[PDB]
Design a protein around this nucleic acid. Structure first.
Ligand code: B12
Ligand code: SF4
Ligand code: SF4
Length: 376
RNA sequence: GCAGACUUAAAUCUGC
């Protein structure tokens, strides 16, 4: 009965494109609670997580009388077919692989909906509660306890066949399914991810200072701290460094889901056009990727910083207009700072003009930084 | 229609 239901669920999940499925109980996540209290007090959290620790570690609070959790994982592509070349006149930014093609929030919500349907179509009264990323549970904690993959040193859940390049989701049920056993650590004495992290956000194996992680920094809506502006490169959203150096990901390039295939012109887009983009054109072109959940502003800020990184002089006119006309303090100030960074002294007069008119205190400071740079 | 804010992609509010 319960065993047959479990095998039928696994059979259906694979047919609708789930790459890996696993089972765990609805027991509380005790070690996780202690861990979350630790990270919180160390200031190592991001603020993006659920504030209520009880709801995060107690499945039976989320779904009354729950008895199990079904965890699913989908592998996403890692290599890009015919990536467009970034030249001196035409510089390009880059999205992380978790932001290629169709938003996994929607892809995996679909798989969870079909699996909720499947169970509810058989026995009653099977009750469920699904979630992907935006739920209370820790998708990694569930995936680990369900045997999807092991906790690697880069904090990533890593699977034997697909590596770390997988999306995670889970469904809480009232079915007392038989749980699986967690898989073993494959990292060994390797430390490549820890050593290659540009900001040392990986303070220890399996421990992240989220405030120092590039991925987090690309999604903040305010001014990017001076400390990290030199380490973003041309990233527009997220970071893949602790994964692309990982030996467990060598050869892992799976094209199993067509809608996840990146559009090279929007995954690796031209920087300058992003600066003058309209809301409709952004919604049409970027509105269906995961990296647009905070809006266009963090992406544009990063695009500016990316141009400063490249010292693209051809971006100076658009940056200048942005400094003068844009109603967003973060955009004005960053444009001012980038202008000074690119290093053309001819634009110094324009910085002073902007300075004399700025009313936003923080934007003022960024202009002053930009002026100081151009003197040098 | 355009733009901004906000929580988060269409909802709410504001400006043209
Ligand atoms: C907040 C958040 C972030 C934050 C911080 C992530 C972090 N490491 O804490 C930021 C914005 C930086 C981020 C970045 C990324 N994230 Co993110 N993020 C989340 C989110 C919403 C919650 C994660 C969280 O609460 N972390 C807090 C820590 C404490 O817990 P946890 O890592 O989830 O759980 C593990 C630890 O607690 C550990 N642990 C427990 N006890 C102990 C004890 C010891 C001693 C140690 C060492 C560890 C340890 O074991 C748990 C299970 O592995 C989840 C979705 C979700 N709802 O769960 C996605 C999620 C974790 N992110 C994901 C992705 C894809 C990424 C990025 C790769 C995106 C990118 N390309 O930039 C990067 C990777 C950066 C990295 N190396 O961690 C995937 C991870 C998939 C996978 N294969 O593991 C998730 C699961 C989203 C999803 N639904 O697929 N993200
Ligand atoms: S995503 Fe980038 S910044 Fe964050 S821990 Fe990994 S390598 Fe470091
Ligand atoms: S780089 Fe090495 S230590 Fe880091 S996750 Fe990959 S195998 Fe593990």
């Amino acid at each position: 009965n319960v065993y047959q239901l479990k095998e039928e669920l696994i059979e259906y999940a694979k047919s609708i494109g789930v790459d890996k499925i696993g089972f765990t109980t609805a027991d509380t996540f005790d070690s996780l609670k202690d861990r979350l209290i630790l990270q919180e007090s160390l200031g190592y959290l991001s603020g993006f997580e659920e504030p209520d620790i009880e709801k995060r570690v107690t499945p039976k609070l989320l779904l009354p009388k729950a008895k199990s959790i079904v965890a699913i994982a989908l592998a996403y592509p890692s290599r890009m077919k015919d990536a467009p070349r970034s030249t001196r006149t035409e510089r390009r930014g880059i999205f992380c692989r978790a932001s290629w093609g169709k938003d996994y929030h929607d892809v995996l919500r679909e798989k969870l909906d079909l699996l909720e349907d499947f169970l509810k179509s058989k026995h009653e009264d099977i009750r469920t509660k699904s979630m992907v990323d935006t739920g209370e549970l820790s998708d990694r904690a569930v995936a680990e306890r369900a045997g999807i993959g092991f906790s690697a040193k880069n904090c990533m859940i890593t699977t034997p066949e697909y590596g770390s390049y997988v999306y995670l989701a889970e469904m809480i049920t009232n079915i007392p399914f038989e749980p699986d056993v967690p898989i073993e650590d494959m990292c060994g004495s390797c430390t490549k991810c820890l050593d290659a992290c540009p900001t040392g956000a990986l303070v220890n194996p399996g421990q992240l200072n989220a405030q120092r992680c590039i991925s987090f920094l690309t999604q903040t809506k305010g001014f990017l701290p001076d400390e990290f502006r030199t380490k973003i490169g041309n990233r527009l959203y997220g970071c893949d460094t602790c994964q692309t150096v990982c030996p467990l990901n060598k050869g892992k390039d799976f094209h199993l889901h067509p809608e996840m295939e990146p559009d090279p012109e929007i995954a690796k887009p031209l920087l300058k056009p992003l600066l003058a983009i309209s809301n409709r054109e952004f919604k049409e072109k970027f509105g269906h990727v995961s990296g647009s959940w905070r809006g266009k502003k963090p992406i544009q800020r990063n695009a500016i910083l990316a141009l400063a990184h490249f010292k693209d002089a051809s971006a100076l006119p658009e940056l200048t207009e942005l400094m003068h006309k844009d109603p967003r303090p973060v955009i004005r100030g960053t444009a001012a700072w980038a202008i000074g960074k690119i290093g053309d002294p001819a634009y110094a007069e324009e910085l002073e003009k902007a300075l004399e008119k700025e009313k936003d205190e923080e934007a003022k400071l960024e202009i002053e930084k930009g002026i100081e740079l151009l003197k040098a």
